[PDB]
Amino acid sequence: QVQLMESGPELKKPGETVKISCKASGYTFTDYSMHWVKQAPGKGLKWMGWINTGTGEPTFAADFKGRFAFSLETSASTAYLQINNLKNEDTASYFCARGVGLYGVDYWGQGTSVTVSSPKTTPPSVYPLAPVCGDTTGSMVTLGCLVKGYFPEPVTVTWNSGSLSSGVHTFPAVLQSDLYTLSSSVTVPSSTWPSETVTCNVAHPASSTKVDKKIVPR
């Protein structure tokens, strides 16, 4: 099977240099243009360029010219995008793509997301978010977990060890001052809270911090 396999997602800092691998598999490396495509975290596919697999000769889009090094290891059939002078714009998911050429790119690297930024690994502030009079919706008391100020992602936010799946909506962690806050919300019936404990169990493998906060009535 032809499979484009790449390096792993990598946290980086501004000014650094990243080289994302792409290893060819299941096909003759030489014969197909190896391509690179930038998917910015919010943006769609923005094609970075292609390095000629026969010659090892890179070709860059006017954008990607000059900051980025396409390189091809031949024997082991690995392709590389090396980004130099890492920038917070260089934070993005990056894809090597095997050219079927004038038919474009058939397959794709499994994906490699660079995160270029300064911050240091930080534990979350996990806040049990209790409902008030209006926050009790029908029989259900919606409950919440404010997971606040951690770098990097992810945190693993479960609810009573994940025993609450359904009413849970764990909402996306986003950047705050290069730290992450997610406010996760379980919807539990007022019959089960605070009669049954609702404890949002928040594990942050990067900071190695597992923080468990029971939501208690205000």
């Binding site: 030489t30 014969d31 010659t55 006017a62 050219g99």
Partner: protein
């Protein structure tokens, strides 16, 4: 891969002297190799494939006039100022409107206008260049053993039969050894650098289609064209026009789509199909077979003891040899099939030779169909298959009577010469003596003369013949023949070779 039913199927005659042999092998023709101690090989290019290509430049063959703006100025106001000259997307044109008092000006007879029409491209096309590394050569190579209608045609079986192989040579992999199984192994030694000039041309994409175009000639295209990447063009004007200036009014029109003329510009240009890659149907490659490890099974087996029966009936593939598929009743298989090529049963002696050497029943299967071809000679004949009572013959005739063979091949010689240039002396394979200097004679000869005045197309050099013959008609002895050199051949031949 095989030579079966190949329109151009040409027979490589084993002279021994080496197990290796140089060949010019191509996708058009399947070269069939008969050799002593060797079965009947097939050699043909499948196709030529340049895997990965680069874009030399792009052309805009149909363009779009947008936002025509004409900034007028009075008489004697001189150079007309339209800011759109700051935008290349705008094509700006200076000019004037000769003015009266009726139009915008207190003076008669002159004016100034700057006509800026924003250029855009309706339709653009692209040429592309081949890297000789990305060039492949797909060479179907086969050898004739026991075969049937299908297995010989279907490549899947002759893999398993180990009688066929398909492979790829590059300037990086110029030679390949390839194993024949029961028949051992052979080796090809190619010139994948030299199978083309990768830079003799470009692959020019016109429509979904791409085309071979001389990369000289490709520049010679006069038309809006592009930085191979992206944007800023040259002669983007030449698909646009200009008009009179009637008062301030002058207009710009984008010429009708010239794509039709693109195709018209493509005459000798070759259809090239991009898939993951171009596939060039026209082969030119010089490889070298090596027959040493190619073996013979069947030298052990004895006479097949059972009834020959025609599964196919005597017929010529078109190349002068008769193929038949024989259902073989006997179960004594695997066995060596007795067969010969005879004229009359008045004699048991062969006359022609076996196309497929070692006629053999593959397996113990009774009534087993065996596809085998042989060579009849000229005139009528029979075919004695086996001795004794079991022999079935069939009367055969081949009308090619011997003289015509000596004629056609002779006249084929000049046909072998033209269009093959210096490599026309590679039909002198394992050369020396004549064929050593024969190419070297033609070497600078072909690299001069016909190419020096080259660019001649049909009547251009076709009408030169009587003109140069007439100068040979009135001339001096020892001058006439010297003046006759350029006349006949290399000029008339290719001009006669095109008849039609």
């Amino acid at each position: 891969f095989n030579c079966l039913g190949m329109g151009n199927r040409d027979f490589i005659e084993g002279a021994s002297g080496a197990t290796w042999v140089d060949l010019v092998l191509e996708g058009d023709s399947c070269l069939t190799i008969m050799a002593n101690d060797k079965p009947t090989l097939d050699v043909r290019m499948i196709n030529i494939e340049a895997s990965q290509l680069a874009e030399v430049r792009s052309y805009c063959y149909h363009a779009s006039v947008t936002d025509i703006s004409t900034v007028a100025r009075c008489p004697m106001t001189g150079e007309a100022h339209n800011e759109k000259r700051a935008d290349s997307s705008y094509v700006c044109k200076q000019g004037f409107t000769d003015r009266g008092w009726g139009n915008g000006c207190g003076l008669f007879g002159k004016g100034s206008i700057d006509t800026c029409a924003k250029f855009s491209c309706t339709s653009k096309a692209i040429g592309r260049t081949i890297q000789p590394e990305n060039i492949k050569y797909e060479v179907g190579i086969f050898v004739h053993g026991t075969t049937t209608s299908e297995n010989h045609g279907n490549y899947s079986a002759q893999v398993g039969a180990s009688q066929a192989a398909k492979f790829t040579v590059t300037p990086n992999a110029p030679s390949i050894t390839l194993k024949l199984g029961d028949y051992g192994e052979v080796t090809l030694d190619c010139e994948p650098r030299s199978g083309l000039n990768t830079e003799a041309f470009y692959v020019m994409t016109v429509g979904s289609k791409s085309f071979l175009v001389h990369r000289e000639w490709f520049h010679d295209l006069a038309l809006p064209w592009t930085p191979p990447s992206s944007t800023a063009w040259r002669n983007r004007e030449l698909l646009m026009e200009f008009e009179e200036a009637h008062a301030t009014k002058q207009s710009v029109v984008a010429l009708g789509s010239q794509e039709g003329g693109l195709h018209q510009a493509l005459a000798g240009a070759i259809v090239v199909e991009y898939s993951s890659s171009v596939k060039l149907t026209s082969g030119h490659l010089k490889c070298r077979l090596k027959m040493d490890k190619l073996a013979l099974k069947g030298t052990t087996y004895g006479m097949c003891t059972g009834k020959f029966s025609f599964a196919k009936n005597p017929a010529d593939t078109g190349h002068g040899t008769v193929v038949i598929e024989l259902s073989y009743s006997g179960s004594d298989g695997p066995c060596k099939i007795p067969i010969v090529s005879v004229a009359s049963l008045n004699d048991m002696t062969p006359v022609g030779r076996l196309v497929t050497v070692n006629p053999f029943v593959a397996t113990s299967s009774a009534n087993s169909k065996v596809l085998v071809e042989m060579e009849p000679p000229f005139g009528d004949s029979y075919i004695v298959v086996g001795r004794g009572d079991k022999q079935i013959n069939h009367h055969w005739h081949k009308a090619g009577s011997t003289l015509g063979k000596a004629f056609l091949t002779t006249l084929k010689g000049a046909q072998r010469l033209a269009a093959l240039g210096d490599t026309a002396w590679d039909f002198g394979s394992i050369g020396g003596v004549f064929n050593s200097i024969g190419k070297a004679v033609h070497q600078v000869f072909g690299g001069a003369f016909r190419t020096l005045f080259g660019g001649m197309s049909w009547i251009t050099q076709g009408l030169m013949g009587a003109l140069l013959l007439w100068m040979g008609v009135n001339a001096r002895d020892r001058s006439i023949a010297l003046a006759f050199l350029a006349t006949g051949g290399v000029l008339l031949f290719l001009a006669t070779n095109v008849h039609a």
